[PDB]
Amino acid sequence: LAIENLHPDDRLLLVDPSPVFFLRRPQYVSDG
Amino acid sequence: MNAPDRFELFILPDDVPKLKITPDSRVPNCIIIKFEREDHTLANLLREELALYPDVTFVAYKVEHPLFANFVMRLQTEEGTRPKQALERACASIINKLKTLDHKFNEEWNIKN
Amino acid sequence: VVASKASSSMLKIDQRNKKLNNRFIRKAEMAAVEKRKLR
Amino acid sequence: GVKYTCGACAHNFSLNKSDPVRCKECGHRVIYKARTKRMIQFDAR
Amino acid sequence: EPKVNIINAQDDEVELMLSDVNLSLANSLRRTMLAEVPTLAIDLVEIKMNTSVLADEFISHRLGLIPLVSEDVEEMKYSRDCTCEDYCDECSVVLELSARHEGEEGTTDVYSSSLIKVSGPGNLNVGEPVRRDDYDQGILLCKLRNHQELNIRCIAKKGIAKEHAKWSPCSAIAFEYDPHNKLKHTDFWFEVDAKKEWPDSKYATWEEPPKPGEVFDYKAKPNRFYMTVETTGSLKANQVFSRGIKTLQEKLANVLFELENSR
Amino acid sequence: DDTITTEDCWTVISAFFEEKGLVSQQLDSFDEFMETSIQDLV
Amino acid sequence: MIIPVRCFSCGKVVGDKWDAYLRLLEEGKQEGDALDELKLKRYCCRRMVLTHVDLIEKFLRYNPLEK
Ligand SMILES: [Zn+2]
Ligand SMILES: [Zn+2]
Ligand SMILES: [Zn+2]
Structure with missing residues (x-):
């Protein structure tokens, strides 16, 4: 299970005291 | 190739005095002190200690070039007092302040540990 | 080849990051294009 | 008199300024001089 | 007259507050700990x-x-x-x-x-x-x-x-004074409103925010300085602070000795 | 079907660079030369 | 080539945290969370570990020149 399996109302209870397309996760081998 | 040795910033040559005092005859009771192998750390401390003395009418310093480790201080005092005595009083006062600061820090560290 | 432990760990990290990027960036792009379309 | 090292099998040997420049065991044509014995010092800066 | 108050204490970092000292003294202490502790x-x-x-x-x-x-x-x-x-x-x-x-x-x-x-x-x-x-x-x-x-x-x-x-005992020394900018030592760049475009300092709750009807006090000077000293492990934080104080005292005593010997 | 995102375009570009590489024109021209051009010139 | 001993900007020792960083990334933590776990707060220190490329692993694949 994960955050997705959580109920939406309980997800609403997780309030910081969305991903953006231009912040990639770093790699080491790349591709090509 | 032309880079100076790094220890020249703080090691005093045998023929170079640590301190050279000359009078400034333009205004009365003023001297020019040249400090060798020193920088802003001592200069700013001495200047802002001396600036609070009632009998000190002028105090300033300048580092002429950052590639040379020296600064020059100008000090002017009242008629009664001599500038060298004011400089000695400033040094003693800062030493006393640092002593009590160290004592209180050690006390608080022992309390909190 | 007899690969080192650090290199194998980095390969696993790279596979996980590639999968996560392929999911998240595509989802964010879909959300952005639908929002730009509905305006 | 002078040590060498083969460029392929990393074998050590010596030459007397009269042998052909070759590896003894694998016959490679590329050999390298060995590091000196003088003291080597660095200033760690 | 000078006072020391310690907020957090550890082997490798101490967070303290200096009060009733000059700004030049605190800055010289920071510089000494950064560059002159052996x-x-x-x-x-x-x-x-x-x-x-x-x-x-x-x-x-x-x-x-x-x-x-x-x-x-x-x-x-x-x-x-x-x-x-x-x-x-x-x-x-x-x-x-x-x-x-x-x-x-x-x-x-x-x-x-x-x-x-x-x-x-x-x-x-x-x-x-x-x-x-x-x-x-x-x-x-x-x-x-x-x-x-x-x-x-x-x-x-x-x-x-x-x-x-390589001989530096410290890595980074955080240093800060006047979180509410009562001395007006900085002029805040803004687009609409400076108050809500700038994040609050981490010591903003340690000082009372200025009253709306208060007028600028031109007689005030910086008095309280917050600093954190982080060490690389070669020395403990209290050792670094004490030896910085001692190094500054030795430099001043050398100046005094040169002055007295000049006669 | 479903729409084509920018990530799909980058997947296609990755396929291109996986197949061709960056110096494919040089190698292909030299291979054509060695394979047929010498015989035709003779 | 190999992880620097000290941070370039401030001089914090970051050369003892490379293997722990790789371990944390193996366990599934995000890079920011992994850097937070290693107590790298200033972004100058985070840059040192986040942007390092380990080239010594490629250099070690060539056979040794002396035996
Ligand atoms: Zn050989
Ligand atoms: Zn000795
Ligand atoms: Zn740093």
């Missing part, structure tokens, strides 16, 4: 064999940056002030590293815990490389594969960060 660091490297993929000066530079224990470095002497021939036990510490990979497969990591102290001052706590725990391996120095060996002999000497940054 420590111990490797300065000469004798390389007896190095068959790794790293250049000799590369490894020497990495060795210079390893923090060593410098607790008793005040009792040691400067190498140029020691009358001894070559290096002795009163002005240097000798460390030795010997690493090799056994087997025809895999890779061996060379850590700073492999440095062994061979000689140094008698009964002084100086020379050993710093380690966070007993099971910590330390700083990664090199990597070796089969038939590659590293065999070096290092000499640790006393120095200050003015000569080279």
Whole structure:
């Protein structure tokens, strides 16, 4: 299970005291 | 190739005095002190200690070039007092302040540990 | 080849990051294009 | 008199300024001089 | 008159508040702790064999940056002030590293815990490389594969960060005063409203925000200074603070001695 | 079907660079030369 | 080539945290969370570990020149 399996109302209870397309996760081998 | 040795910033040559005092005859009771192998750390401390003395009418310093480790201080005092005595009083006062600061820090560290 | 432990760990990290990027960036792009379309 | 090292099998040997420049065991044509014995010092800066 | 208040205390970092001192005194203390507190660091490297993929000066530079224990470095002497021939036990510490990979497969990591102290001052706590725990391996120095060996002999000497940054006991000293900008020492850039475009300081709750009807006080001076001192492990934070104070006192006493001797 | 995102375009570009590489024109021209051009010139 | 011993900007020792960083990334932590776990707060120190490329692993694949 994960955050997705959580109920939406309980997800609403997780309030910081969305991903953006231009912040990639770093790699080491790349591709090509 | 032309880079100076790094220890020249703080090691005093045998023929170079640590301190050279000359009078400034333009205004009365003023001297020019040249400090060798020193920088802003001592200069700013001495200047802002001396600036609070009632009998000190002028105090300033300048580092002429950052590639040379020296600064020059100008000090002017009242008629009664001599500038060298004011400089000695400033040094003693800062030493006393640092002593009590160290004592209180050690006390608080022992309390909190 | 007899690969080192650090290199194998980095390969696993790279596979996980590639999968996560392929999911998240595509989802964010879909959300952005639908929002730009509905305006 | 002078040590060498083969460029392929990393074998050590010596030459007397009269042998052909070759590896003894694998016959490679590329050999390298060995590091000196003088003291080597660095200033760690 | 000067006061000290400690907020958080640790072996490697202390967060304190200085009050009733001049700004110049606090800044000079910061500068002294950054650049003028003596420590111990490797300065000469004798390389007896190095068959790794790293250049000799590369490894020497990495060795210079390893923090060593410098607790008793005040009792040691400067190498140029020691009358001894070559290096002795009163002005240097000798460390030795010997690493090799056994087997025809895999890779061996060379850590700073492999440095062994061979000689140094008698009964002084100086020379050993710093380690966070007993099971910590330390700083990664090199990597070796089969038939590659590293065999070096290092000499640790006393120095200050003015000569080279490897002798600095501190990493970064946070420094801050007047979180609410009552002295108007900075003029805040803004687009619409300066108040809501600038994040609040972490010490903003330690001082009372100015009243809306208050007028500018031109007689005020900076009085309270917040600073955090982080150390690399070569010295403890309280040791760094005390030795910075002592170094400043010694510099002032030297100035006073030169003045009195000038007559 | 479903729409084509920018990530799909980058997947296609990755396929291109996986097949061709960056110096494919040089190698292909030299291979054509060695394979047929010498015989035709003779 | 190999992880620097000290941070370039401030001089914090970052050379003892490379293997722990790789371990944390293996366990599935995000890079920012892994850097937070290693107590790298200033972004100058985070840059040192986040942007390092380990080239020594490629250099070690060539056979040793002396045996
Ligand atoms: Zn051979
Ligand atoms: Zn000696
Ligand atoms: Zn840093």
